[PDB]
């Protein structure tokens, strides 16, 4: 439906930048102020390129849950003058399944990609490249390398960021409002 596609487009236009680390280009979601998120396996350092502009990393936090298990989300505070539109009111407050989701990616390899991935289902556990990870969402689409950081949305909800796949299915780390309280 147009609302979902329009919402995804709005999120990408106003709340995403192309972040480049030592590992390559990632889709980076801006949440509020100078705070953004990126998959932890991107290996954020003291500096990060934001749309080909070297930006100092004022602070970084690789999120882990109460069990000390990886969540694959790294929150980053960026030394920039622009301020992200506050989208925290689009973040779910608890873990849930969703329908008619869209995965949106923007990098030099995947410019302006929009994928209707369909039903999204939450699982408490995923062995991501050998790293136990929690609070995962799964969708039945053959996602591929270079899509990490891609934003998963439904109409009015920014629910996760893409982190991996198995060839036939894709997996996203879940975004929760409590992460940015």
């Amino acid at each position: 439906s147009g609302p979902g596609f329009d919402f995804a487009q709005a999120i990408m236009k106003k709340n995403t930048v192309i972040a480049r680390t030592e590992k390559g280009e990632f889709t980076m979601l801006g949440v509020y102020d100078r705070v953004a998120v990126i998959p932890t396996h991107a290996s954020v350092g003291e500096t990060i390129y934001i749309n080909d502009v070297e930006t100092k990393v004022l602070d970084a936090c690789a999120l882990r849950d109460l069990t000390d298990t990886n969540l694959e989300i790294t929150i980053v505070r960026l030394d920039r003058n622009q301020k992200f539109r506050d989208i925290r009111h689009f973040l779910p407050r608890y873990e849930d399944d969703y329908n008619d989701a869209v995965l949106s990616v923007h990098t030099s390899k995947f410019p302006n990609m929009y994928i209707p991935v369909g039903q999204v289902t939450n699982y408490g556990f995923l062995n991501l490249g050998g790293t136990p990870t929690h609070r995962i969402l799964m969708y039945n689409f053959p996602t591929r390398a270079g899509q990490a950081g891609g934003v998963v949305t439904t109409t009015g909800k920014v629910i996760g960021i893409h982190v991996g796949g198995n060839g036939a299915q894709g997996f996203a780390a879940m975004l929760l409002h409590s992460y940015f309280s």
Partner: peptide
């Protein structure tokens, strides 16, 4: 699953 960055 495998991390699918660049």
């Amino acid at each position: 699953a495998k991390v699918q960055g660049p």
